[PDB]
Write a protein that binds this ligand. Structure first.
Ligand code: NFU
Ligand code: SF4
Ligand code: SF4
Ligand code: SF4
Ligand code: FES
Ligand SMILES: [Fe+3]
Lengths: 138, 298, 447
């Protein structure tokens, strides 16, 4: 009766290509996520993650190049520093750290992207809906 | 020009800053017909045909909600007066707890409190709304004056502009503009993070580059930067600029980006979360009710 | 029948008065309700303890200095640091300037409209604008007093509202000799205006006595105020309690406040009802604020205030229990604070650069006490080893006059109201005049 609402941010170069690779390979995974394209994972910031939770996101995914393989050299290192703060900020807000998932996925890694989507879906499905959207609506 | 003020979940500071017009308060009141103001006059009901309304404080209880709606109906122009009305302010930290936790502390478990039947005040008093809300979240707000409290001149410019019929316009840059402290032209790099009691801050060097979480970079100008001038980091009380919605999120983004930037690929990304014990209190002092996530879930 | 005075006006914060009548029409129950609360005591848990002087000023925009200093003192005990003397003088300097601003604000802009027009129908006239139109020089003196006090705060605290200089171990910045020089130059005018304020106070309280209003809300109680060898002090010393006959019951350090003070809860007000826990709810009623501080003190600390205070004691004795004479005590403190500003600006240690000591090991417990303009103010913080607040308790000034205000408004109703027809606009405003005499700050009292 209820399906997780998951939001994804994937870099254009590596992770967005990994999601394409999974589609070319007919690698099925749950239809919860919607992916938003950015050029680089360094484009991702806390406000975008928090904005998604505000809108109703039960889980948030971010995918970028492997560390060192950034198409723009070092965008992912900035993103990695931000997401570690964001994990613990989400806890101070009573949002399970597990509701946020960041992975490093290259364009060739369609299989890894498939199981990442499956592992994250099951994790969020077991957590149940995130109750933020329904508290603000009181 | 009939104007009215009122206050909600604030501390009266915005009204006091209005009185800190000093001599100019009289010149202001000569040109304006003040028809309602609880702190200064005895008009009990908000009259009809109010042209301008200054509403201080955010929404903290059911009575605040009804007054905000009544003033919106009665007033032509509603102004969010101060940071509490605009962003939620310091009382917004109450959103980190349930009302039950807020009330049980004040009226049961405080050390000096004595309440044998364990009652929570409930007669002739309003209940709290579920969370502190900015004024714009419950009514339509036409203008706002940021600041905790807004400086007196800024209050003067906004109102006189509206008396003249011109739109008020706030300053738009972040705080480093007004601040007299010196930056590195090579850019901000942060080696370690210090709590404001640690070390001896150099009077002329930017406090953020010294390692102190300073909110000047994520805070609108206008105040004159008295806190960094006086030897302490900016706490962000004026709120974000027009191009930032979540002041705390942007400060975190900036802080994380430049932490260990000189050693970008090797600095451990877990040093920064572990060195900050109170994160919401570091970055959301005055604006938590207006953040994307304005509460702690329980 | 039921009548409501809401909002109570020309006070800080949200309060209302209820008057109910039974089936016979006879006066039945009269209550003072405070209808606001924000919960600072709970949401301070989890914050950095050194940020407490940043949050607690936002309890109130009038007395933000008092909270800033009370939290700083508590923080100074949480860390095991003793601030250097120059820091002590700067904080007290800022404290006196704030008291000048607060007392002037209340007597002139909140209280005086009733003292000038106690029996008027013209409600749009009972405000500073009404005073300014018929006696403009009085409101301009009020403004110049506030401007002088706030100016002291801005210079020493960095901001006139919500100061930030009081940090762990002392002050974040020092006072410069040029700033010291112009503040000292300006201090003389503040003292003169305070003397003139006392004289107008005499005139307007005479007008009040002429109308048989000087004894409204009268009852007898204990009185609490901080003294320094029995000398009136707003910044440092021990808390002294005097019983209704003037006998000193106890003298205790503020760190022991919990062994002497208890706060009760009633269902009809967010404002609690303190009392001397030793004496109990009814016999332990005490008051704080201007007049209570005079009753407990042996003498004032400044010469000009001593003279008016001696003259006042000769006329009304010790202790004085009249609510409306809190106004006159407020004007004496107004002068004494003005004098103390000058005295502190003349103390050559005011411009010292040794303004802060390095914070020591974290004790984890700290109590900070100061006499706010509206009574004894206590900040009690407890932290963990990282200095993160785990528990806070705030006994904030006006809360301790809430029993006095609740008793007072019903004794005003007993004197003037027998039937609903007696609750005229002027009589209902009498009830608010009893409230206003105590200078209540209801955002502060509830926090
Ligand atoms: N004076 C004062 Fe407050 Ni606004 C009260 N009541 C203080 O701590
Ligand atoms: S803004 Fe700063 S000042 Fe104006 S009210 Fe909310 S808190 Fe008191
Ligand atoms: S201090 Fe706070 S404000 Fe002055 S510069 Fe460094 S940051 Fe921008
Ligand atoms: S500085 Fe940061 S804090 Fe001090 S005022 Fe300007 S804004 Fe409010
Ligand atoms: S472009 Fe993919 S992480 Fe930078
Ligand atoms: Fe309390």
């Amino acid at each position: 009766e209820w399906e997780p609402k998951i939001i994804g941010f994937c870099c254009n170069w590596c992770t967005y290509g990994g999601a394409d690779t999974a589609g070319v390979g007919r690698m099925q995974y749950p239809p919860s996520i919607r992916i938003i394209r950015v050029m680089c994972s360094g484009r991702i910031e806390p406000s975008l993650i928090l904005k998604a939770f505000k809108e109703g996101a039960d889980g948030v995914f971010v995918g970028g190049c492997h560390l060192g393989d950034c198409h723009y050299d070092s965008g992912n290192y900035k993103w990695q520093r931000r997401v570690m703060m964001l994990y613990e900020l989400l806890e101070e807000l009573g949002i399970e750290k597990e509701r946020l998932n960041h992975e490093w996925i290259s364009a060739s890694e369609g299989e890894k992207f498939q199981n990442t989507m499956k592992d994250f879906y099951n994790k969020i499905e077991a957590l149940g809906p995130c109750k933020l959207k329904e508290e603000l609506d009181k | 020009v009939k104007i009215a003020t009122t206050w909600l979940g604030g501390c009266s500071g915005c009204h006091i800053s209005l009185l800190d017009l000093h001599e100019e308060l009289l010149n202001l009141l000569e040109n304006v017909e003040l028809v309602h103001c609880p702190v200064l006059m005895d008009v009990k009901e908000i009259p009809d045909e109010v042209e301008v309304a200054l509403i201080e404080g955010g929404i903290r209880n059911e009575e605040n909600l009804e007054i905000a709606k009544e003033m919106r109906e009665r007033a032509k122009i509603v102004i969010a007066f101060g940071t509490c009305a605009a962003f939620g302010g310091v009382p917004g930290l109450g959103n980190l707890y349930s009302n039950d936790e807020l009330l049980d502390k004040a009226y049961k478990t405080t050390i000096t409190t004595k309440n044998d039947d364990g009652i929570i005040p409930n007669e002739e008093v309003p209940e709290l709304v579920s969370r502190v809300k900015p004024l714009s979240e419950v009514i339509e707000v036409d203008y706002f004056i940021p600041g905790c409290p807004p400086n007196p001149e800024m209050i003067a410019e906004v109102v006189k502009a509206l008396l003249e019929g011109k739109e008020p316009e706030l300053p738009k840059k972040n705080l480093c503009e007004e601040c007299a402290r010196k930056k590195s032209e090579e850019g901000v790099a942060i080696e370690t993070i210090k709590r404001n009691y640690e070390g001896n801050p150099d009077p002329e060097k930017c406090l953020l580059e010294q390692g102190y979480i300073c909110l000047g970079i994520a805070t609108r100008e206008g105040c004159g930067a008295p806190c960094p001038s006086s030897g302490v980091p900016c706490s962000g009380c004026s709120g974000p600029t027009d191009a930032v919605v979540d002041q705390g999120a942007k400060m975190i983004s900036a802080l994380c980006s430049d932490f260990g930037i000189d050693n970008d690929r090797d600095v451990d990304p877990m040093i920064l979360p572990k060195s900050i014990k109170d994160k919401i209190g570091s970055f959301y002092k005055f604006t938590l009710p207006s953040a994307f996530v304005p509460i702690r879930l329980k | 029948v039921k009548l409501s005075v809401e909002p109570v006006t020309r006070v800080e914060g949200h309060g209302k008065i209820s008057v109910s009548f039974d089936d016979s029409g006879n006066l039945d129950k009269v209550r003072f309700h405070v209808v606001e609360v924000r919960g600072f005591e709970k949401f301070l848990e989890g914050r950095y303890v050194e940020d407490a002087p940043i949050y607690t000023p936002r309890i109130c925009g009038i007395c933000q200095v008092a909270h800033h200093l009370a939290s700083a003192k508590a923080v100074d005990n949480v860390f095991g640091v003793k601030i250097p003397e120059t820091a002590e003088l700067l904080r007290n300097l800022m404290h006196q300037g704030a008291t000048v601003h607060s007392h002037a604000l209340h007597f002139y802009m909140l209280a005086a409209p009733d003292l000038m027009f106690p029996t008027t129908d013209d409600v749009l006239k009972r405000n500073l604008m009404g005073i300014a139109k018929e006696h403009p020089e009085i409101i301009k003196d009020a403004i110049e007093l506030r401007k002088a006090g706030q100016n002291v705060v801005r210079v020493v605290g960095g901001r006139a509202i919500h100061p930030v200089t009081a940090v762990v171990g002392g002050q974040s910045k020092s006072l410069k000799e040029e700033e010291r020089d112009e503040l000292l130059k300006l201090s003389e005018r503040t003292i003169e205006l305070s003397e003139k304020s006392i004289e107008v106070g005499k005139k307007l309280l005479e007008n009040i006595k002429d109308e048989d209003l000087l004894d409204i809300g009268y009852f007898e109680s204990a009185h609490m105020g901080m003294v320094n060898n029995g000398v009136h002090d707003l910044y440092d010393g021990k808390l002294r309690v005097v019983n209704s006959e003037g006998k000193v019951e106890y003298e205790f350090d503020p760190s022991e406040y919990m062994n002497y003070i208890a706060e009760g809860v009633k269902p009809y007000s967010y404002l609690k009802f303190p009392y001397l826990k030793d004496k109990g709810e009814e016999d332990g009623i005490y008051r704080v604020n201007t007049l209570s501080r005079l009753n407990v003190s042996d003498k004032m600390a400044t010469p000009l205030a001593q003279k008016y205070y001696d003259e006042f004691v000769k006329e009304f004795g010790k202790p004085c229990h009249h609510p409306m004479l809190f106004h006159y005590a407020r004007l004496i403190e107004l002068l004494s604070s003005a004098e103390m500003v000058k005295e502190l600006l003349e103390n050559d240690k005011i411009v010292g650069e040794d303004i802060r000591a390095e914070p020591e090991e974290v004790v984890g417990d700290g109590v900070g006490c100061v006499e706010a303009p509206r009574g004894t103010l206590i900040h009690h913080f407890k932290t963990d080893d990282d200095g993160i607040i785990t528990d806070t308790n705030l006994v904030v000034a006006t809360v301790q006059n809430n029993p006095a205000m609740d008793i007072g408004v019903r004794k005003v109703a007993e004197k003037y109201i027998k039937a609903p027809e007696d609750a005229t606009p002027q009589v209902l405003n009498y009830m608010e005049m009893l409230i206003r005499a105590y200078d209540p700050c209801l955002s502060c009292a509830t926090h």
